[PDB]
Design a protein around this ligand. Sequence first.
Ligand SMILES: *[C@H](O)C[C@H](O)[C@H](O)COP(=O)(O)O
Length: 252
Amino acid sequence: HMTDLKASSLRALKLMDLTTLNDDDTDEKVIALCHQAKTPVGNTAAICIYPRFIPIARKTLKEQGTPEIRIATVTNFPHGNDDIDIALAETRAAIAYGADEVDVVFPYRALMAGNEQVGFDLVKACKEACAAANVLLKVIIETGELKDEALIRKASEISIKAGADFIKTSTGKVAVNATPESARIMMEVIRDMGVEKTVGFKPAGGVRTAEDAQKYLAIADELFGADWADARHYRFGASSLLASLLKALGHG
Ligand SMILES: *[C@H](O)C[C@H](O)[C@H](O)COP(=O)(O)O
């Protein structure tokens, strides 16, 4: 018997960027994560790991017959510093390791201190490098630190103007990460700029249960209709959600 929660949970699984971003990460932990991404009901959209683990992850995904699971990574992370040369160097290294996607942290503290230009320039530099390599760029704005709706909107806007392919709520590394309100605000920016075709949305950080995921897809479906949230336009950033989705589906 189909239910709303089973329908949402299978969608969320297929849209997941299955993540491990810990100081104690090892090859063994990344290999296990790759195996976890290959589920009895389908594959996650991607994995997300630190750049140094990309080569061993690629090998693992290939050997288990899921070369289509994308490899995302993070740069300028988690602090979102305003040194463009460092963020760009990290992005270029992520590309060289073999990333399919880079999730870069926007210089949100700089924006809070009144500097809008540095975020534009940082995202644009990283976008140029990624685009040349056929790599997607997601931009993490850190909604939990920005806090104010106007600042969330402005960081989203600047990121889109600079070429972001996705806007992502959070690093998962601060006290407040994804919220339904933050998701609505960011998706409203996509709407207001008319960039539904070219910009996806990624809630991240603290999305732990199947019910949590359902709340985020409900907002996407309201705003853009239920066909918009495909893997080019929607991802879940989550280290600890997949088991909950599989349980909801009876395969966990
Ligand atoms: C971007 O890769 C950030 C990740 O989506 C988050 O770190 C995941 O947060 P948790 O699921 O670990 O809370």
